[PDB]
Design an enzyme around this catalytic site. Structure first.
Site, PDB file in Angstrom:
ATOM      1  N   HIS A 185      -8.683  11.075   3.004  1.00  0.00           N
ATOM      2  CA  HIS A 185      -8.963  11.541   4.356  1.00  0.00           C
ATOM      3  C   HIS A 185     -10.203  12.372   4.379  1.00  0.00           C
ATOM      4  O   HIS A 185     -10.825  12.545   5.418  1.00  0.00           O
ATOM      5  CB  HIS A 185      -7.796  12.384   4.852  1.00  0.00           C
ATOM      6  CG  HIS A 185      -6.497  11.640   4.915  1.00  0.00           C
ATOM      7  ND1 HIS A 185      -6.347  10.476   5.636  1.00  0.00           N
ATOM      8  CD2 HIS A 185      -5.291  11.895   4.356  1.00  0.00           C
ATOM      9  CE1 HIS A 185      -5.105  10.043   5.515  1.00  0.00           C
ATOM     10  NE2 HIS A 185      -4.443  10.887   4.743  1.00  0.00           N
ATOM     11  N   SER A 191     -11.376   5.876   5.523  1.00  0.00           N
ATOM     12  CA  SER A 191     -11.214   4.562   4.915  1.00  0.00           C
ATOM     13  C   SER A 191     -12.486   3.743   4.984  1.00  0.00           C
ATOM     14  O   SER A 191     -13.388   4.051   5.755  1.00  0.00           O
ATOM     15  CB  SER A 191     -10.075   3.811   5.592  1.00  0.00           C
ATOM     16  OG  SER A 191      -8.862   4.527   5.481  1.00  0.00           O
ATOM     17  N   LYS A 209      -0.107  -2.245  14.130  1.00  0.00           N
ATOM     18  CA  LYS A 209      -0.513  -3.202  13.102  1.00  0.00           C
ATOM     19  C   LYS A 209       0.273  -3.002  11.812  1.00  0.00           C
ATOM     20  O   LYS A 209       0.694  -3.975  11.175  1.00  0.00           O
ATOM     21  CB  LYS A 209      -2.015  -3.081  12.844  1.00  0.00           C
ATOM     22  CG  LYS A 209      -2.663  -4.358  12.355  1.00  0.00           C
ATOM     23  CD  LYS A 209      -4.162  -4.325  12.573  1.00  0.00           C
ATOM     24  CE  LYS A 209      -4.855  -5.443  11.817  1.00  0.00           C
ATOM     25  NZ  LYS A 209      -6.331  -5.391  11.985  1.00  0.00           N
ATOM     26  N   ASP A 210       0.509  -1.745  11.429  1.00  0.00           N
ATOM     27  CA  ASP A 210       1.327  -1.452  10.260  1.00  0.00           C
ATOM     28  C   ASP A 210       2.781  -1.818  10.498  1.00  0.00           C
ATOM     29  O   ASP A 210       3.465  -2.252   9.572  1.00  0.00           O
ATOM     30  CB  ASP A 210       1.192   0.023   9.891  1.00  0.00           C
ATOM     31  CG  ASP A 210      -0.078   0.319   9.115  1.00  0.00           C
ATOM     32  OD1 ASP A 210      -0.977  -0.550   9.089  1.00  0.00           O
ATOM     33  OD2 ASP A 210      -0.189   1.423   8.550  1.00  0.00           O
ATOM     34  N   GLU A 239       8.433  -9.380 -17.579  1.00  0.00           N
ATOM     35  CA  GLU A 239       8.459  -9.841 -16.207  1.00  0.00           C
ATOM     36  C   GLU A 239       7.081 -10.286 -15.765  1.00  0.00           C
ATOM     37  O   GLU A 239       6.078  -9.893 -16.356  1.00  0.00           O
ATOM     38  CB  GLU A 239       9.002  -8.743 -15.308  1.00  0.00           C
ATOM     39  CG  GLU A 239       9.561  -9.240 -13.988  1.00  0.00           C
ATOM     40  CD  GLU A 239      10.431  -8.204 -13.307  1.00  0.00           C
ATOM     41  OE1 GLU A 239      10.760  -7.187 -13.953  1.00  0.00           O
ATOM     42  OE2 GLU A 239      10.788  -8.408 -12.129  1.00  0.00           O
TER      43      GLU A 239
END
Ligand code: 3PE
Ligand code: HEM
Lengths: 189, 400
Positions: A10, A14, A36-37, A80
């Protein structure tokens, strides 16, 4: 550590896919990107519940449904899937120690990544040669994921050895040289 | 209060007057012609005719018009809005005889010397080049553009420089000959005038005047220019109209509201309008104010108080225009009342419509016009912290 991750970000905000300074065009998050999230959360929940409720064992191993026998070792031991790329690298290096180190570097090479940026453009949206090298990197990451699965025998081994050599050479050598060439093409270098 | 007496002549021109004991008078001509009647090919015709109307008529070539109206000692005046045009003279009552004949020339027999036309073009253009200094007018001419997109109510009174340069006598002549009809004209007089003498003068002069879907779009225009020291933001919703009765309950609501320069407006046009607030603030506080404003509108919508309503009714009561305000103010009201309502609404009817307003119908009408409505937003200046349309639209309603 994720709270520290959010803080250290922050402070800078971004990034955008063009890689440019997006200070002229910024919007709020709550009303704009939250929906959107929320939509991404809904799609991820759709994929998670179709993984759980329909194919609950396509990603796991059947031999984990047997109890732990120290006297018998399952003949085919595979870590895995998401550890596979590393597994391949480890198996590739002949020396045990070498394998361990390379394995670690496999993850650590990323940390080393911000010191290898030799381009005057931040993103790869306007950089086609490094885009090609990036997709070759994704390609042999998928190859290393496949090899890990394959057993120890020809020619899986050689691919593993090359794929590891190509992985380290693309991240270490090929991308900064390509960025220098791309800067030379735009009459910047 | 003396009643406003209205007569009607052959042409259709109305002759309205409201006699008062003051000594001077304000005699004006109103015309139902503005930028709303222009069709984007003559977008500055009314403004440029308003410039040319005092530069001489056949009877008064050159400076004659200004000279005589100067000699008589009369401060002539004029103005143009999106719906109405007014040419009025303030003068000693005894001069009505000439205050009326002069007005007759100004509406008909006017002469648009092409020579003058050239200069006025330059005047208008140059001023417009500087009209940008009036930030508030800018904000209010976009609060109009973005709210009435695609309609003749978006276009400004002045018009775009383009049209201003590209205008000719014939075009003007058209606007003049098209939108200056006698049934769309009111001769209004206020002050020391006799109605019979004014009617005889209108019969003698001005008896020649020839007898012959606006939509609000919830939208946003943001003119960002960070070098300006202050930011001006206007937020409006669709006003009821000119004739709609609820206008009065909305005026009381504005009287309840009354960061910085937070004015409030109820602009009314023919069955439409803009009801809202314009505020100028430092960039860093735009967000806060926009929110405060909303909270307030919302307060009235759900939480009015008889006390405050009273505060609002009283302030409205002291706004009504009257002989005390003077001739011009009154004339102006006579001209607008005959053009819009078709009659002069007396102050007693205004007082009755004010006293019938209570808190319940105020919050009902405010919920009808403010609650969950899409606003038009116009910002100019350092308006980065001005919230975008989702935040304002969400502030147009309360969860609770
Ligand atoms: C899965 C990869 C899909 C793909 O072809 O890549 C899209 C490309 C790069 O995507 P990237 O953000 O690098 O994702 C890497 C994931 N390992 O995206 C880009 O190339 C970004 C720079 C150019 C963007 C132009 C618009 C691209 C839109 C791509 C999604 C829509 C089209 C999908 C294919 C049809
Ligand atoms: C524990 C797993 C992780 C979580 C939960 C996590 C979470 C997040 C979140 C929530 C953001 C902000 C939202 C976003 O940018 O999309 C973010 C940004 C970011 N993360 Fe992660 N992250 C994780 C691991 C990583 C790793 C391993 C890397 C390095 C490879 C990384 C690098 C970044 C970067 C560079 C950004 C900023 C992206 C940008 O704005 O350009 N993160 N992370």
């Amino acid at each position: 550590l994720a709270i520290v991750h959010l803080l250290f970000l922050h402070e800078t905000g971004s990034n955008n896919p063009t890689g440019l300074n997006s200070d002229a065009d910024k919007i709020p998050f709550h009303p704009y990107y939250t929906i959107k999230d929320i939509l991404g959360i809904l799609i991820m929940f759709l994929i998670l519940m179709t993984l759980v409720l329909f194919f609950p064992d396509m990603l796991g191993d059947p031999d984990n449904y047997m109890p732990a026998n120290p006297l018998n070792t399952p003949p085919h031991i595979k870590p895995e899937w998401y550890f596979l790329f590393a597994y391949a690298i480890l198996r590739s290096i002949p020396n045990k120690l070498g394998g361990v180190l390379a394995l670690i570097l496999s993850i650590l090479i990323l940390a080393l990544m911000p010191f290898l940026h030799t381009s005057k453009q931040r993103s790869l949206m306007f950089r086609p040669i490094t885009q090609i090298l990036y997709w070759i990197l994704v390609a042999n990451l998928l190859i290393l994921t496949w090899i890990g699965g394959q057993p120890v025998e020809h020619p899986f081994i050689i691919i593993g050895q090359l794929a590891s050599i190509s992985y380290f050479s693309i991240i270490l050598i090929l991308m900064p040289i390509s960025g220098i060439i791309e800067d030379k093409m735009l009459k910047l270098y | 209060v003396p009643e406003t007496q209205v007569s009607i002549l052959d042409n259709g021109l109305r002759v309205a007057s409201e006699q008062s004991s003051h000594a001077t008078c304000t005699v004006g001509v109103w015309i139902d012609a503005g930028s709303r009647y222009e069709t984007e090919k003559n977008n500055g015709a009314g403004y440029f005719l308003e410039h040319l109307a005092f530069k001489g008529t056949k009877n008064r070539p050159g400076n004659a018009l200004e000279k005589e109206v100067e000699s008589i000692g009369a401060h002539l005046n004029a103005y143009s809005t999106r719906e109405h045009t007014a040419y009025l003279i303030k003068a000693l009552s005894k001069d009505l005889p000439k205050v009326v004949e002069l007005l007759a020339d100004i509406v008909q027999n006017s002469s648009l010397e092409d020579s003058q036309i050239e200069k006025e073009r330059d005047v208008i253009l140059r001023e417009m080049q500087e009209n940008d200094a009036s930030m508030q007018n800018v904000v209010f001419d976009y609060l109009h553009a973005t709210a009435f997109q695609g309609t003749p109510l978006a276009q400004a009174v002045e018009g775009p420089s383009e049209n201003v340069r590209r205008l000719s006598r014939t075009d003007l002549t058209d606007y003049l000959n098209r939108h200056y009809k006698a049934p769309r004209m009111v001769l209004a007089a206020a002050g020391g005038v006799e109605h019979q003498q004014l009617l005889d003068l209108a019969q003698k002069h001005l008896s020649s005047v020839s007898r012959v879907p606006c939509r609000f779009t919830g939208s946003e225009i943001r003119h960002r220019d960070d070098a300006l020291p202050l930011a001006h933001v206007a937020i409006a919703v669709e006003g009821p109209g000119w004739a709609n009765p609820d206008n009065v309950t909305l005026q009381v609501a504005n009287a309840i509201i009354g960061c910085q320069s937070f004015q409030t407006f109820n602009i009314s046009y023919s069955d439409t309008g803009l009801l809202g607030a314009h505020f100028v603030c430092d960039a860093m506080s735009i967000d806060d104010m926009v929110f405060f404003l909303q909270g307030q509108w919302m307060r009235l919508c759900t939480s009015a108080t008889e006390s405050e309503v009273t505060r609002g009714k009283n302030i409205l009561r002291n706004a009504l225009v009257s002989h005390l305000d003077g001739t011009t103010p009154v004339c102006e009201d006579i001209g607008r009342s005959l053009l819009t309502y078709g009659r002069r609404i007396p102050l007693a009817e205004w007082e009755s419509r004010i006293q019938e307003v209570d808190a319940q119908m105020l919050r009902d009408i405010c919920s009808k016009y403010f609650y969950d409505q899409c606003p038009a937003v116009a910002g100019y200046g350092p308006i980065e912290q001005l919230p975008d349309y989702n935040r304002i639209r969400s502030g147009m309603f309360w969860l609770r």
